[PDB]
């Protein structure tokens, strides 16, 4: 698809068998999801944004669908205000910016 | 252009007679620039993102040239860690996400 930016670029994702809404975010290095359960071990990460920093849990090699496109990769979990799909998975689904 | 997402989508902008580097951010509603002078009246605003909120000055009807493409809109000025071009100006230069 071609997604214009007059509204927030929100899509449906599937993670853990559940559907969630997330923001396609070219300004994010990483994918950050609100608190949920994911399998396996996690590692710590401190991430930054416009208002300072938050601590998140890094899970690797997580199966995730983004607007129907299949990806397997790193997902951060923590107190993000919104679910964000960052460049680590935008690249897996072949996303580009065009103008 | 077509911009891939293997790295941060950083571009050169011209604003207020100055050249700056800024991040094309589809996950931002607003355009937020580090401290600089801009013409006209302003009013205070709070904006939020991953780590909470920061206080900015809102300037309206500001012209920017983004990677060679002119646009006008509201520009917020304040203690952002990265200059960000948000959707309010991304729309105006015809930027879309494609996959």
């Amino acid at each position: 698809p071609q997604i214009t930016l007059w509204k927030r670029p929100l899509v449906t994702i599937k993670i853990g068998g559940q559907l969630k809404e997330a923001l396609l975010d070219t300004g994010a290095d990483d994918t950050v999801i609100e608190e949920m359960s994911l399998p396996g071990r996690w590692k710590p990460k401190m991430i930054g944004g416009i208002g300072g920093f938050i601590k998140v849990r890094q899970y690797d090699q997580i199966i995730i669908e983004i607007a129907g496109h299949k990806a397997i990769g790193t997902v951060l979990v923590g107190p993000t205000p919104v679910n964000i799909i960052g460049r680590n998975l935008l690249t897996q689904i072949g996303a580009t910016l065009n103008f | 252009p077509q911009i891939t997402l293997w790295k941060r989508p950083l571009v050169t902008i011209k604003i207020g007679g100055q050249l700056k580097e800024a991040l094309l951010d589809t996950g931002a509603d607003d355009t937020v620039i580090e401290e600089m002078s801009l013409p006209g009246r302003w009013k205070p605003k709070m904006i939020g993102g991953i780590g909470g909120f920061i206080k900015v000055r809102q300037y309206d009807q500001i012209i920017i040239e983004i990677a060679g493409h002119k646009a006008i809109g509201t520009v917020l000025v304040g203690p952002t860690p990265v200059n960000i071009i948000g959707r309010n100006l991304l729309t105006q230069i015809g930027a879309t996400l494609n996959f």
Partner: peptide, 10 residues
């Protein structure tokens, strides 16, 4: 009001 999701790795 949060709407600017800049996100940066450590």
């Amino acid at each position: 009001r949060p709407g600017n999701x800049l996100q940066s790795r450590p």
